[PDB]
Amino acid sequence: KMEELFKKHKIVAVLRANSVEEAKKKALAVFLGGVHLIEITFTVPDADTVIKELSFLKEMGAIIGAGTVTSVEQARKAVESGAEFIVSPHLDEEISQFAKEKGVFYMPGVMTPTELVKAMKLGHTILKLFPGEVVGPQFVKAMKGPFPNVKFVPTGGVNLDNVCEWFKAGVLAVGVGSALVKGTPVEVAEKAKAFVEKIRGC
Amino acid sequence: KMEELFKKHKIVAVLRANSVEEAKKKALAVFLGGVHLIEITFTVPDADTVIKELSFLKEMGAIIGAGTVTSVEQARKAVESGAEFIVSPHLDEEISQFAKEKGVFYMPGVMTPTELVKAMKLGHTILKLFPGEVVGPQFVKAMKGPFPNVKFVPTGGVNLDNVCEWFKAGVLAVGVGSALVKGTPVEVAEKAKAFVEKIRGC
Amino acid sequence: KMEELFKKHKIVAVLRANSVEEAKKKALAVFLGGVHLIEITFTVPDADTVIKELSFLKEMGAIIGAGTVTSVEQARKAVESGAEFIVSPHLDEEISQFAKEKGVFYMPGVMTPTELVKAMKLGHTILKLFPGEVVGPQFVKAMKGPFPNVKFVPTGGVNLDNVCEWFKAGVLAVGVGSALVKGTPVEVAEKAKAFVEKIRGC
Amino acid sequence: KMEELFKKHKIVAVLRANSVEEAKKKALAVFLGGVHLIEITFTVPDADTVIKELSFLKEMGAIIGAGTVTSVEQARKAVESGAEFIVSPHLDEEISQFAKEKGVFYMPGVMTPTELVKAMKLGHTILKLFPGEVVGPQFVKAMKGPFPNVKFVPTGGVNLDNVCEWFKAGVLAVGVGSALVKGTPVEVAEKAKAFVEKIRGC
């Protein structure tokens, strides 16, 4: 199901913000603009409260998860507050195990073939590729040779000009932060619309 | 001896293909065009059978190995079928150990200084650099400072325009996949000739 | 204090050389040109002797450390000879632990989010980013999102044209090798002056 | 079956070479370029060994025979080493008889109506016409009148410019030597491709 949602929606908003209020307003902006997968990063102050207060959007079909999860303690709080998926920038064995026992989808981040293989050995085949702007689509295309059955969701620098190249390389979905989320609510809602159209357009 | 063969031939064909028949025809094409080091990747269906059926080319001086080796079970099959060398995209401690006991040359893939150091601690000084198109010659030149005695064989994006830059950076040999191997047998045999000449030419 | 010195001086000369004499002359050149943080790499022959013979420059305010430290045995020699800080290209748990017990500042090198997190778990928040020319400022900016409290000192390709971009990305200091250190003593002393001015200039 | 293979493939490479190694490389070149009928002439040194060492290509669908067979002793060695067909430049009653008892297809060479008739009396209706460059398509057309049921495979001078004229005259297949086989492996593989296309093209 987690796989199937990424496949269908193709875009996850990676939401960094300086306050609970800003984070909630941007999550609403993004949703109102057609982005259903919303990742509340743990760099947001009181990121758990934000996830809990957005729980109602689930009734409107939003899928609210947590990102920048770097300890099992953070993972527990996110899940306790209703996170439907966990994302980290790195591969965390302890978070992998906790999410396995808890029955919650975890997408670890990877930047190398060795990291990729370790993640596969922990049962993962959908991987966050981070930072995407450093490795690029080139990395995604290179992995298709030896690891035809791994799929990536790049985060980092994905924007309006390159989103289609990423999909050409073979990515499953993209995670979009500052290109989507930075600015005012109005600007964010609008940029949300543009990304959906640009993605549909390819 | 394994080192010395890489040093002498300078190019390894990294052979991905959709069938046994295609893989064998491309391995013959490449050999006929002057490429003696042939890596049958385990993304080739029945890659073991292909290695076994190419065993006779060893009598003509071909050196047939296996690539995209990701488990010890695959490693065992490759060696059982006559592989003279094992290559992986990542650093695998279990494959390192098996190849050590079996007395077969293993070239793990590495993308970072930490991975490099771990591989050295496992006894390796000839490393696959993968994906070469992501890190580049720049990475090879950067490693010369702190690790003067490590040598790289980059795989990923090596082509006719950049092969000489790679050798300028200090690589021991190059692994060439799609630029060499994609196309028909005739086109592959011809591209094989071009790479040998271009490499000799630098 | 180690943090505070990096913060104040902003540049560390990464000194590779073919002899004790060349290394000492270049360390003097660099210091005479205004660079106070001097990293004697262990690729310098008898790098310990060089650190010991430069010990007097500490009385003039030079801070002499060791780089390219790849084993605890090398780490011990460097510290025994008066190294005030230890730098490696990779993350080394054994060197981390030794430096912790010995009470000496260690800056491990990292290239990925997973490596970064492991280093943080070992108590490090100032990280060498290596090779900087492969990942770039882009990597430093990407890390600010999920890891706002990590600071980088990139080594690899930092030069007169890009030093200000690096500081724009949010680095704590830069480690400069060949752009600073290559050439004759006179040329090195002069390039030292240029880097200090260019850094002040941004 | 022998008839039917000639009919289907339309071209037999007549392989003369100065060594075992050259002969094998050219047979591979030709096969890789789409020529399935390969005639190893007995002017090749150790022509039997070459036929035996190419025996595996039979598993890839190559049909390996012997040419320039001029005694029953040579015929025996060729058959013993796996030759699937025997070709001679002349009509040899002794080779005809041996091949009849052994159950192996023999194509004797003929240049005159009297030779043709003698071959028919020995049970042959598929004849090598040799030397084709001396008699020409004219000879093939002339034979259609009195001997409508004889079919020729000309050897001698068949090339890219005249191959279609030969087929216009009514030949069953062509045997191509120097126009196909002379040059390096790469050049031979390529010329092989050209002949197949030119033949298909008519």
Numbering used by the authors:
A (entry chain B), B (entry chain B), C (entry chain B), D (entry chain B): 0 to 201
Study authors write:
In the present study, we used the SpyTag/SpyCatcher technology for the assembly of SARS-CoV-2 RBD on a protein nanoparticle platform, SpyCatcher003-mi3. The VLP platform, based on an engineered aldolase from thermophilic bacteria, spontaneously assembles into a hollow 36-nanometre dodecahedral cage with 60 subunits. Each VLP subunit is genetically fused to SpyCatcher003-protein, allowing efficient decoration of the VLP with SpyTag-fused antigens through covalent isopeptide bonds. VLP display of protein antigen has been shown to further enhance immunogenicity by facilitating antigen drainage to lymph nodes, enhancing uptake by antigen-presenting cells and increasing B cell receptor crosslinking.
In the current study, we investigated an RBD-based VLP vaccine candidate for COVID-19 based on SpyTag/SpyCatcher technology which was used to assemble RBDs into the mi3 VLP via the formation of an irreversible isopeptide bond. The SpyTag-RBD can be efficiently conjugated to the SpyCatcher003-mi3 VLP, with 93% display efficiency reached after 16 h. This corresponds to an average of 56 RBDs per VLP. We saw no sign of aggregation following coupling and the RBD-SpyVLP is homogeneous, as shown by a uniform peak of the hydrodynamic radius (RH) at 20.7 ± 4.2 nm in dynamic light scattering (DLS). Cryo-electron microscopic analysis of RBD-SpyVLP cages confirmed the presence of reasonably uniform mi3-cages. In addition, at low contour levels, the resulting icosahedrally averaged reconstruction, to 3.7 Å resolution, showed decoration commensurate with the anticipated appended SpyTag-RBD. The low level of density is expected due to incomplete decoration and likely flexibility of the spacers. All tested mAbs and ACE2-Fc bound strongly to the RBD-SpyVLP, showing that a broad range of epitopes on the RBD-SpyVLP are exposed and correctly folded. Testing resilience of the vaccine candidate, we found that RBD-SpyVLP is stable at ambient temperature, resistant to freeze–thaw, and can be lyophilised and reconstituted with minimal loss in activity or immunogenicity. We showed RBD-SpyVLPs to be strongly immunogenic in mice and pigs, inducing high titre neutralising antibody responses against wild type SARS-CoV-2 virus.
